[PDB]
Amino acid sequence: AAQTNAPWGLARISSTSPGTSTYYYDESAGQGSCVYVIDTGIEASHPEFEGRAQMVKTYYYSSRDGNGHGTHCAGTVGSRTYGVAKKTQLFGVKVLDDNGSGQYSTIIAGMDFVASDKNNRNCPKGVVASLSLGGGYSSSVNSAAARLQSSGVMVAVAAGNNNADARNYSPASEPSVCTVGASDRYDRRSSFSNYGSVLDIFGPGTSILSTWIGGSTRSISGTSMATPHVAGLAAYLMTLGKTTAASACRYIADTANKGDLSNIPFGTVNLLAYNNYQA
Ligand SMILES: [Ca+2]
């Protein structure tokens, strides 16, 4: 399939070169997979989700996304226009309030929730979780992410927006999950993107157009935006049968565009998420 005039990040993920505008992908499009977006929620009513999104959990007085950030991330995973995996099922877990903040204890509860909740969902092709959040180093937060991964979920987490080594942030620093840095449309490391040995992969993160609340759309930037490209890619690849939850981060790294990003610090992977789709 070909989507013309796609957001640059979608075009980038299916291209051996920057500077193109058509997204190419297998029509299966993540059908039969599921992606949890652990964030401020998802506006499930947004036409862009086509009934494929739903809220499954909140820790606050509402499951509504009163911020937009979760809706944006979910859009990059699986919206019809702005998404990588256009037929995946999206499940929202609201661990962040409408200010985009969340106590680590609530975030941890949300991760353990997903590990159990997948057993209540139909995801024959596999399960992914996208965590566009983080804070300072916490062994408990890392351990929760590790459990989620161990339970059979492909966990993708944001590296962070500190232009610093991600070893000092969680869940970014957890070795067993897929830690995602951000790049821009000219294949530069995004200026805010964290880096370091704990990174596994980069994805498009600067000036990313996606869904927003009130049935709208918005371009924003962050490792929060790169993460759902990788989560959606994992779901897409799992539907194709190319990989599994336990191996998807490795597979994505194995098949990534290599050595093409600029301003990658010595010791950080130079790998850009790529679907290796040949039309
Ligand atoms: Ca690893």
Swiss-Prot record:
Catalytic activity of the protein: Hydrolysis of keratin, and of other proteins with subtilisin-like specificity. Hydrolyzes peptide amides
Disulfide bridges in this chain: 34-123, 178-249
GO biological process, one term: proteolysis
Residue sites binding Ca(2+) 1 per the record: 175, 177, 200
Cofactor(s) annotated in UniProt: Ca(2+)
Residue span, Peptidase S8 domain: 7-279
Catalytic class of the enzyme: hydrolase
Co-factor binding details: Binds 2 calcium ions per subunit.
One CC-aspect GO term: extracellular region
Record keywords, A-Z: Calcium, Disulfide bond, Hydrolase, Metal-binding, Protease, Serine protease, Signal, Zymogen
Positions of the catalytic residues: 39, 69, 224
EC number: 3.4.21.64
Entry GO MF terms: metal ion binding; serine-type endopeptidase activity
Annotated positions binding Ca(2+) 2: 16, 260
Family membership noted in the UniProt record: Belongs to the peptidase S8 family.
Summary of the function given for this chain in its UniProt record: Hydrolyzes keratin at aromatic and hydrophobic residues.
Identification of the protein by name: Proteinase K
Source organism of this protein record: Parengyodontium album (Tritirachium album)
Gene name linked to the record: PROK
Location of this fragment in the whole protein: 106 to 384 of 384
